[PDB]
Every structure is written in C-alpha cells, then in structure tokens.
From Swiss-Prot:
Region annotation (Interaction with methionyl-tRNA synthetase MES1) ranges: 18-42
Subunit structure, as described in the record: Component of a yeast aminoacyl-tRNA synthase (aaRS) complex formed by methionyl-tRNA synthase MES1, glutamyl-tRNA synthase GUS1 and the tRNA aminoacylation cofactor ARC1 in a stoichiometric complex. Interacts (via N-ter) with MES1 (via N-ter) and GUS1 (via N-ter). Can also form a stable binary complex with either MES1 or GUS1 that is functional in terms of aminoacylation.
Residues spanning the signal sequence: none
Region of interest: Interaction with glutamyl-tRNA synthetase GUS1: 48-57, 87-115
Effect of residue 22 to R: Abolishes interaction with MES1
Gene (name only): ARC1
Native organism: Saccharomyces cerevisiae (strain ATCC 204508 / S288c) (Baker's yeast)
Entry's localization field: Cytoplasm
Function description: Binds to tRNA and functions as a cofactor for the methionyl-tRNA synthetase (MetRS) and glutamyl-tRNA synthetase (GluRS). Forms a complex with MetRS and GluRS and increases their affinity for cognate tRNAs due to the presence of a tRNA binding domain in its middle and C-terminal part. Binds specifically G4 quadruplex nucleic acid structures (these are four-stranded right-handed helices, stabilized by guanine base quartets). Also required for cytoplasmic confinement of the synthetases and tRNA.
Family: Belongs to the tRNA-aminoacylation cofactor ARC1 family.
Note: Present with 57700 molecules/cell in log phase SD medium.
UniProt name for this protein: tRNA-aminoacylation cofactor ARC1
Membrane-traversing stretches: none
Amino acid sequence: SDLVTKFESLIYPVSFTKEQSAQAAQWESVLKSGQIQPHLDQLNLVLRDNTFIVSTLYPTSTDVHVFEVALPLIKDLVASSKDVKSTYTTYRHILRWIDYMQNLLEVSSTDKLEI
C-alpha cells in the first residue's frame, strides 16, 4: 500500500536508451515552457517515422503529456484554419497519433477531434 505507491514512484521500460531518456526530458521541457506550438513541425516529423513520441512499442507518459497539450492546439489550428485540407496535410502524422491516443484514453465527445 505504502509499498506500491513507493514502487510506482520509482524508475521507463528497462530497454529504454539514454537517447530515449534525453528526448523524453526534452519534450517535458517544451511542455513546461509552453512551447509545444513552435515544436509541432518537429513532433510531426518525429511521428512520421515513429509510432510513438519516444520510439516505444507502447505509449509512454511522454505521449500522454504531449497529447494533452497538442489535442486542443491542433483542434484550434483546424478551427482557425484558412484551408482545412492544407492543415490536415501539414500535420498528418500528429493527426494519426491524435486519432490513436484519443481512442486509447477514451476521450470525450466534444473534446475529441474530427478526423
């Protein structure tokens, strides 16, 4: 009970690399500084070639944390978009991952995005 909360407060899969670790820290830093928007293009390029943000076989808390910020942001960019198709084309790989993550996390009708 005490043990468990302590356990789950411990350290990331054991095959996690130094690079995966640094990239998780880096995204957490962009989240903390509120710079996800100027990092969207990069997020999109990462997801082009990687199923999940830090190249895992399952989503990590890094996926979840970035998603919380990126979902309403992308929803907003579509809303404000001068041409929606151009917007969809510009963030294809984020949209793919948004579709995955919002289903995984059983997201609300009304906060969910189209697709």
